[PDB]
Every structure is written in structure tokens, then in C-alpha cells.
Amino acid sequence: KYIEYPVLQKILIGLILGAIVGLILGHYGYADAVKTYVKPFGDLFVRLLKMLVMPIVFASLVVGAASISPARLGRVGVKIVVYYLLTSAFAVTLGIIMARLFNPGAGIHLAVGGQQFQPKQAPPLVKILLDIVPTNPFGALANGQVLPTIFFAIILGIAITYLMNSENEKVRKSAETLLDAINGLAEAMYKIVNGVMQYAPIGVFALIAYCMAEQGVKVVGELAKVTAAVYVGLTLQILLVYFVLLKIYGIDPISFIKKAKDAMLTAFVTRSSSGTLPVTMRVAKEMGISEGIYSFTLPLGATINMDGTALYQGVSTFFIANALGSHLTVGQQLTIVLTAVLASIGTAGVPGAGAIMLAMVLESVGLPLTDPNVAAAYAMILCIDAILDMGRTMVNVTGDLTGTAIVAKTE
Amino acid sequence: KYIEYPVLQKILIGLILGAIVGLILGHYGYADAVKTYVKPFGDLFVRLLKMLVMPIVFASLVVGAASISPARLGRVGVKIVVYYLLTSAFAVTLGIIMARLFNPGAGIHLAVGGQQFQPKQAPPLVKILLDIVPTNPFGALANGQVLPTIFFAIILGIAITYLMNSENEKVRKSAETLLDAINGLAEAMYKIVNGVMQYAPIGVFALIAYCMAEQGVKVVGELAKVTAAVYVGLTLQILLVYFVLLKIYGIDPISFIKKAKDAMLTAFVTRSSSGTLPVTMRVAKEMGISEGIYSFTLPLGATINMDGTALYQGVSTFFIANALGSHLTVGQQLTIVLTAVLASIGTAGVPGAGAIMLAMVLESVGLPLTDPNVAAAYAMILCIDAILDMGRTMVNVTGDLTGTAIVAKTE
Amino acid sequence: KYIEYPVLQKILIGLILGAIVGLILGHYGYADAVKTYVKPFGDLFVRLLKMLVMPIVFASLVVGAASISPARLGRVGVKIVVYYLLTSAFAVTLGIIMARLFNPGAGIHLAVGGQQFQPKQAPPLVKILLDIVPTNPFGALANGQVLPTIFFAIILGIAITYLMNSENEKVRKSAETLLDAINGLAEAMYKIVNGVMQYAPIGVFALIAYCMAEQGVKVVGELAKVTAAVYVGLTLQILLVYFVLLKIYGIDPISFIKKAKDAMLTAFVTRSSSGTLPVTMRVAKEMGISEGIYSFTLPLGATINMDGTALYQGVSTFFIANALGSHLTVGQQLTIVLTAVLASIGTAGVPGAGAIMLAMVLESVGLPLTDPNVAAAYAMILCIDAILDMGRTMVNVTGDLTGTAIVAKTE
Numbered sequence A, B, C: 001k002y003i004e005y006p007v008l009q010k011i012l013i014g015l016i017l018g019a020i021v022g023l024i025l026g027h028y029g030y031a032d033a034v035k036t037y038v039k040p041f042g043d044l045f046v047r048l049l050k051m052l053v054m055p056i057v058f059a060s061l062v063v064g065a066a067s068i069s070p071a072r073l074g075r076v077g078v079k080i081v082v083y084y085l086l087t088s089a090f091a092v093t094l095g096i097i098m099a100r101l102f103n104p105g106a107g108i109h110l111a112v113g114g115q116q117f118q119p120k121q122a123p124p125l126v127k128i129l130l131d132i133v134p135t136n137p138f139g140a141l142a143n144g145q146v147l148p149t150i151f152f153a154i155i156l157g158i159a160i161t162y163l164m165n166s167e168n169e170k171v172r173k174s175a176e177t178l179l180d181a182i183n184g185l186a187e188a189m190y191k192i193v194n195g196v197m198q199y200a201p202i203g204v205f206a207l208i209a210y211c212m213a214e215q216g217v218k219v220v221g222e223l224a225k226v227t228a229a230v231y232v233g234l235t236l237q238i239l240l241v242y243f244v245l246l247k248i249y250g251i252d253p254i255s256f257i258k259k260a261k262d263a264m265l266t267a268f269v270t271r272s273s274s275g276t277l278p279v280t281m282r283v284a285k286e287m288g289i290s291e292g293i294y295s296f297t298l299p300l301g302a303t304i305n306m307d308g309t310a311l312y313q314g315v316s317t318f319f320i321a322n323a324l325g326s327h328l329t330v331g332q333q334l335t336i337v338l339t340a341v342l343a344s345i346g347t348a349g350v351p352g353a354g355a356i357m358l359a360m361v362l363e364s365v366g367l368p369l370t371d372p373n374v375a376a377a378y379a380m381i382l383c384i385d386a387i388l389d390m391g392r393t394m395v396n397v398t399g400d401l402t403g404t405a406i407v408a409k410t411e
């Protein structure tokens, strides 16, 4: 196979060629040839992604809840975690704002199979509240049911950490063995992400060739319209949040950005906040942060606290709905806020990861990826995921450095 | 929240206030206001309990079967385990006796939603026997099917212990890693039990306010009628079993009770045979039992061998049926005997645990907690669980000391 | 119970007595008495086997893929693994050949319940390809779906091994903890195999008494006709493959066989290539193989590389079909080739294991053991499994020694 090229370059080549191939075949009237021959490769790609969506959600949120659990956090831990959560929550809400004053997805509205998407009637508020508690965690796990899985995973993670405080040796031993296995399943799933992302240049080529062969050319305008809303959201997160909090804590944001420049560009290109952590930490040393602090806050923020991913997942969910034609209600919007923060946490810091955890948001909000309309819109975003994931990652790391500088400024 | 008060006092306050609130609102004709506003908090409480019911059953019975497995038991182990099982089996059968000459539950008979509970026809005896063997353990686990889960868990635990006898290092390593993870999941679930039991004072308040707003006042008489049957069963277990076997083995039961007085009262109040083990062992030393013996039999009996819990689960199952209106057939009664002994084993020694493992008996006998009638009767017992759990725990510990004294007298 | 006799002797006694009992009861017209009283014991036996089929498939193939993964194999590893795979692939294809020029199963054709087996129409090739990727590993695991489980298990195993290459300590730690738990579940399941195989003498007695009470006597001829096709396949694997490759690498096959004589007979009688490994290794030393080499290749081939099992599973699958009356299409036949190699890998080296992993092949090919016709033919082979398993095991070990000798000759 000798497929050696830098994945990001391969993905962008597949994306450009797919768009061209799709348009010339679609114009000349071969959208069916694309549908039958090209698309199944994109179909395989998305199947491999929604394959990992359930194990990742459970395992990553057990681990995520564990590394946040009150039983684990010192005074510096609580500080950095409160920052991480607030920044992420503000990021997704700002994504809502961007994805609302922009209307990405609108105009694409299609009914694959002639049947337009219809949201099923929401149960009473008491019901949907109680329903987040599963009656059989195994069952909720074994058949979708994302929200119960969220609930059980977060509970399990916290419970494990309190067991790790126990006086008894064997209790800690046992609790750590379970956590040490769940974590490691999560890590295994994200290796599979790396593997599937090696196939991504082909999948993306097919996904965009299909999406170009039909839906004409407006998709190019609408996909760029998403990218716009996301990136201006990212820059707003940098300016309106980082720059502001940095100035509030007596840190010149301009010199701060010049220091972070290396870690920010590394993240932007590598598209992995975990593979940028050595540069991120070297930067934090370069700007005079105390070893004891940033050697703990930065590796925690390498996986938790992805403000870009949260904002991305927020905007992307609005595109899915706007495409489908449904109007995301209030409540559904605050559902996004909560679940995208939780999805931002579960996301690994691997290139593809953010789009996989996006499904967790879609599923909770009521846009199931089994529905053909959802899956078509979901595929529509995977086409240009790498474009978003570059800026996405950069902001994920910038948030780490900012909070680390602020908390060190205090502690 | 600053909720600091002793849980048992909070539960009893919630129980008394709920009863009052329910009655005055029910009398004045506001049972619907209670149904719509108060009850959902009780509904949340029971949902959190039946959430844990499946993981606890699997994990605790893997661990329980492991600590009983013949591959693990020395000569002293076999002795104390044979005692533990016989005493537990006699306890539940005595519970049957008490719950039969008392008729608790009768007179409450209600059909929530109008339709009265109907037991589905039992398959042929060959079928129900074969059916305890699952064809897909994962499947049986993923959708109720308690009895298959019992079967697979018990088998898995025993198999692990034989792997732990193997000559090969890595075999033991792997087998211990799996057991060390299953145990630890069980421990995590029982932390969640502790957590949910912190909400219990509210849940119990709602459960009893609802049960008072409807069903008039007779519930008070019938709940007390259960408490009566349980406690006289507990005292009969002490007198007819412990006192008798103690005298058979040349141990004066009166001086025995005076020695155990501390451990017996500690259990009664703390409601945790595991949190009473330090007192239980200190007592066993006070009464001249050899270190090597009671340092092994007592911590084993701290989790296995809960004669009170078995008896409680036996009586409580009869209340559920008598309420529902069904007549527990012979066979169903010996099913109770077997499954309540197994449920007594799986129970942790945490306050709430016994009522959670009660569901395992109800489910096996054919009273599924999904059915509205079952769930209403099940909630009816949770209201006054702490009352039963006090004596329940005390007898669980008294059995430990009695057997430890008897086996030391021999070995 | 004091059931002490050598299992193989007990199984052969049960098999002979069952055949006699069945025939005299069937001739005298008591096939119904056998159906209602005898058969349920055989039914229990097969239920215990298809119980283990799902956990074993997942866990063994996670472990199997791990011990084959490129991230683990040195230059000697790659050599011995390439040998192991090619030999196993050739073995099953040779089984196909034997089970095709022999027609075992034909003439037995029955429709238990008056309804003859009908294969459900195959989806398009694109569909069945995509379908091997599950959308919820938990779901595929929780309800049959063998092929998705194959896919997820093999992926998970490989991913774990790459995590075990990571620079980070905790990553390797976590990945090894998960693997150390999955392995160990697999080991526990195979202890259950040992346990169930202690009941086998009764189960086999009932299975063959039922199969004799009905289906007259032709079954004896047809069962022997399978045994013939299998054993002549095994001898062909030895002569046409081992002897040939041994001569190609300058090793006199006759002196080789005389050296291996001990390990070959031990396997044949013990029916456990893992319990024969000490003899297998002692033989490899006796014939001048370098310590460093055979101490790694032989224990790997003790579990992976079962040429006899692959060949057995191939032939047996043809019997199941021929009985049922369906014609195994091309494609279905190469499916057998792939899945029987994979089943040969997952098989443990315990007596019973090969027939359990046969179900994995049957399930993938489209012969579900839930269907009554399949289950009847599947039971028809379990009757005489021990006969096949003796030669089966011997060839599994001979392949280990042959490859070890060949690779040592080179490396």
C-alpha cells in the first residue's frame, strides 16, 4: 500500500479531487454511478466512525469523570477544573450564537428517500429527566441509549475515585484495576480512530464526490458557511474569553500569543492536542510558569477542556438540524450546551475524535444517526472535518495554556 | 446542601413527615397533587436502585461464588461455609413460616391502572430448568434475565478460582486480573448505593407520602404487620438456631449474647455488617476465639452469610405477592429459599443493599419490577426498609460470631 | 458422584451404550420415550456449549489477534506466524476437498418439525461487506452477530498491542490491564469447557441415543463417513504438507516422525495440545532444535495454529449443510476457509474447544444454531466429537513441531 503521505495532505487532496470528480460526473448526469460505486467507500468510512461511538462514550466519560471527581482534586485541581468547565461551556454557547446568526445548513434541506425528517414527540419533562437513569446499564449500553450511558459512566468514574480513597488496600487495588481496564479500552478505541483516519482520505473523497454529484454546488457554499461560523467562533473564543481573562489577571495577551505561537501552530497542523503537549509544556516553561503547576494542568487539559471541539460540536449540531429542516428548540439548545461540554471532555485529542463525539451530542438532542436524513447531514460535515479540526485543535491547546497561566498567577 | 445529619435519623424524619403530609393531603383530597409533584422524587429513588440491580447481581455473585469455591476452602473454610449456608437457608425458610402465619400484604391488594397483576403461565419444568442456562451471557445480562445471569456469574467465579490454582504464572495473573476488576465494579456499584442512600430520606418521604395519600391508613397497619413478622422471625432465628447450636457446642448462649452485645448493637445502629467487623472481631477476641480463625471467618461472614437479609427477603417477597394478590406456589417458595440465600450472599453489608438484592428474588420468582403492580408493592417496602435493615444487620453479624465460635470450638 | 474414570473412556462408553440403547428402543418403537426423557440431557449438553460460544469468540480472538499483531512479531515471529497461517489455510481447504469428494451428511436430510431448512437470501456483496463492521460492538456482542464480533475483537487485539508499544508508562499499563482481563475471561470460559466436558459422557449418551432412536441406523454409516473424510484429510495434511515442507528444508520426515512419536501420541490421547506442550518441547529438544527458538514457537502454536481443528471445522461444516440439504456455494466455501482459520486460532487446545468454535463458522456461513435443523445436525457431530478430536489434536501439535523445525533450520 505504501501509503506514506502526511494524512492532512492526503485528506485535502481527496477532498479537492472528490469535489471535482463529483461535480463533473453530476453535471454530465452520472450521480447514480457515484451513488452505487463511489459512495459505499464513504459509507464504510462513516460506519467505522459510528462503530467506535458507543465504546468511546462509555469509557472516555468514565475516565473523564474520574480525572474531574472531587475526591481527586487539590486546591489547584479545583481551580483549573472550574476554569476548564466554564470556558468549555462558554465556548459551546458562543458556538450556538455563531450558528444562529449564521444559518449553516439551511437551504440544503433534503429528504433522502422522499421522506422528510420528523422529530418524535418529546415525553413529559418528568419522564425525560427520569429516563436518563437506566434500569439496566448493560441494556442502555447494548442498544444506543446515549444519555443513560452518559449517566452511568459519569457515576462509575466518580465512584471509582472514592474507592481509590479507601483505607483498605484491596479495595483501592480492585478499583484501580477496573479503571485501568476501562482506560485502555478507551485508548484502544482511539487507536482504531487513528487507523480509520488512515482510510479517511478515501472516505472523504467518496463522501464529497457523492455530496457533489447530487445537491449540486450549493453544498460548497454551505460547507464554507459552516467553516466561517466555526472559525469566527474560534477567534471570538480567543479574543472575547482568553484575551479578556488574561488581561483581568495581569497578563498581556499579545506577548502571551507570541509565546504560545509554537504550541498554537503545532496544534493547528498536527491536529492533535496530545501530540502537541511536549511543545505546549515547553512553551509554558518558556513563559515562566512554575514546573509543579503546568506539569499537572497542561496534561489534564490535553484531554479535558477542548473549547474548540465544544464550539465545533455546537455549531455542527445546528447545521445538522438546519439541513434536516428541524428547529432546535430552547432546552434542546441547552441540552447541546451540556452534552457538547461532556462530548468535548470525552474527545481524545486525536485528529478524528471530535467528529465521533459529535454523534453523542446529535443522539442526545434527538437526531439519531440511524435516520437517513441525519446520517446524510452527518456525512456532509465529515467531508470537511479536517478543515475545522485544525483551528479546533489550536483553540483546545490555547485554552490549556491560558488557564495554566491564570491559575499559576493565583496559586 | 450541607446535609450532615445521621442518615438513619434523616430517613426516620422523612418517613414520619411523609406519613403525616400524605395523610392530611389525602384526607383533604389532594392525592393527585401528591401523585404529580411528590411521587416523582420517590420514582427517582427507586429508579436509582433498580439501576444498580443488574451490575450488582452479576459482580457480587462472581465474587461471592469465588470466596465459596471448593478450590479455595481449607478444612476450616469448608466448616464455616457449610454453617453459613445452612443458617442462611434455615433463615429464609423461617421467614416463609413467619410470612405465612402472618399474612402481610393481604388487604392492600390494588391494581394500579385498573388491571390486576396476572402471573404468566410457567413453562414445562424441563424448559424452566434448561432456561437457567443462557445461550448468550452478554444477552441475558443486557436484558434482565436474572436467573441466567445468576448461573453464569456463579460459574465464572468458580472457574476463576480453579485458574488461580494453576501451575502457570500468567494464567493465575490473568484470572486474578479479571476477578480484581469484577470485584471493584461490585465495590463501585455499592458506593453508588451509599450515594443513593444519601438521597433516601427524600425518596422515602415521597414514597410514603404517596402511599399515604392513596391507600388510606391501612398501609400503616400492614407495614407494621410486615415489621412484626420480620422481627419475630429474626428473634426466632436467634433463639431457635443460634442459641440451640451454641448450647449443642457447649457455649452458654446468655454469656455469648452479653459478649456480643457491643457488636450486635453497633450493627443494629450503623446498619452495616462491614462497618461493624472491627467491633465484631474485637468481640471475638474478647470471648477467647483464636486469632487465626476469627480473622478469617468473620471478614468472610461480613459479606457472605446474612441470615437476617435472607429472612427479610423471604418475608418481603411474600408481602409483594400478597399485595399483588397472587399465591406463591410451592416451588416458587423453594425458589425463594434458593434465590434469597443467593441474594443474601450477594448483598454487601451496606445499609441499602438488602432491598436492592431483594429485586433479584422478586425477578426470579416471576414478579418483574417493570410491572406496575410489582413496582408499587416494591416501593411500599422501601418506605420502611431502614426499620427492617437495623435488626436485619444485627442478625447478620450475630450469625458470624456464632459460627466463628462454633467452628473454633471444633477446629 | 465419585466420577473418576478417564473422560475419554467415559465418553466412549456413553457413546457405545447410547447407540445400543437408542437402536433397541427405536426398533421396539419407543423413540418418543427417548425424545421426552433421554434427549433433554443431551439438550442440556448442547446448551452449555452454545452458552460459551459468544464470550469465547470475542475474548479468544482479542487474545489471538494480539499474539499475531505485527506490533509484536520479531523476524522469527513473522516466520512462524506466516507458516502457521498458511498451514491452517491449506488445512481447511484440504478439508473442503475431502468433504467434497466424500459427501458426508447427504442422505441424513431431515426436517425436524416438518419444515425443511431454507437459507435466507444473501444481501448484495456491498452490504455483507459493510455489515461486518458493527455500529454498536456492545449490540453485536449482545445478540449473536458473530462476524461483527470477529471484526471488533480482531481490531481490539491489534490496537492493544500498539498501545503496548507506546512510550508512556500508564498507556502500556492500561492496555495491558485490559488485555490481562480479556485473557482470563477467555481462560475462565475454557475452564467451563473442562467442566461441561465432565458432563459430556452423559450428554453424548443422550445425543446418540436420540439420534439412534430416530434416523434409524444410517447415521452410524454417515457418522463413520465423516470420521473417514476427516482422518484421511488429517493424514493428507501430514503427508502432503508436513512431509513435503520438511523434505524441502532438508529434514528427513521419517526420522522426524520417529522423534515426534511421543508428543504425537500424547496429544492423540490427552486431546489437549496445551497439556502436551511439555512433551512437545522435550521432543523439540531431543531433535536438536535451539532452546531460544522452540521455547517461543511451540507455546505460541499450542493455542494458535490448529491445522487439524481447521480441517475438522471445514469438513464438519459441509456435513451440517449436506444434512440440512443446502449446497454450500462458492464464496460460502471461502468464507469457511477464512472463518475456520480464525476459529482454529480461537480454539484453546482443550478437548471440547474445537466443536464450540465450529459454531462460529456455522454462524458466519449462514447456518444459525437457533434453527432446529442446524441444531440437530450440530448435535449429530457432537456425538462423535471425541473420535475426531483425538486425531485433530495430534495434527495440531505435529504442525507446531514441523514449523518450529523449519524456522529453526532457517533462523
Ligand SMILES: N[C@@H](CC(=O)O)C(=O)O
Residues within 6 Å of the ligand: A271, A272, A273, A274, A306, A309, A347, A348, A349, A350, A351, A352, A353, A354, A355, A389, A392, A393, A396, A397
Ligand atoms: N483534534 C482535537 C480533538 C478533536 O476535536 O478531535 C485535538 O487534538 O484537540
Ligand SMILES: N[C@@H](CC(=O)O)C(=O)O
Residues within 6 Å of the ligand: B271, B272, B273, B274, B306, B309, B347, B348, B349, B350, B351, B352, B353, B354, B355, B389, B392, B393, B396, B397
Ligand atoms: N445492612 C445489611 C445488609 C443489607 O441487608 O442491606 C448488613 O450490613 O449486613
Ligand SMILES: N[C@@H](CC(=O)O)C(=O)O
Residues within 6 Å of the ligand: C271, C272, C273, C274, C306, C309, C347, C348, C349, C350, C351, C352, C353, C354, C355, C389, C392, C393, C396, C397
Ligand atoms: N483438542 C484440540 C483443540 C480442539 O479442536 O478442541 C487441541 O488440543 O489442539
Ligand SMILES: [Hg+2]
Residues within 6 Å of the ligand: A207, A208, A211, A219, A379, A380, A381, A383, A384
Ligand atoms: Hg459533503
Ligand SMILES: [Hg+2]
Residues within 6 Å of the ligand: B207, B208, B211, B219, B379, B380, B381, B383, B384
Ligand atoms: Hg409505602
Ligand SMILES: [Hg+2]
Residues within 6 Å of the ligand: C207, C208, C211, C379, C380, C381, C383
Ligand atoms: Hg448423533
Ligand code: NA
Residues within 6 Å of the ligand: A303, A304, A305, A306, A343, A344, A345, A346, A347, A348, A349
Ligand atoms: Na476531550
Ligand code: NA
Residues within 6 Å of the ligand: A273, A301, A302, A303, A304, A305, A306, A396, A397, A400
Ligand atoms: Na486541549
Ligand code: NA
Residues within 6 Å of the ligand: B273, B301, B302, B303, B304, B305, B306, B349, B396, B397, B400
Ligand atoms: Na454478615
Ligand code: NA
Residues within 6 Å of the ligand: B303, B304, B305, B306, B343, B344, B345, B346, B347, B348, B349
Ligand atoms: Na451478602
Ligand code: NA
Residues within 6 Å of the ligand: C273, C301, C302, C303, C304, C305, C306, C349, C396, C397, C400
Ligand atoms: Na496446536
Ligand code: NA
Residues within 6 Å of the ligand: C303, C304, C305, C306, C343, C344, C345, C346, C347, C348, C349
Ligand atoms: Na486455536
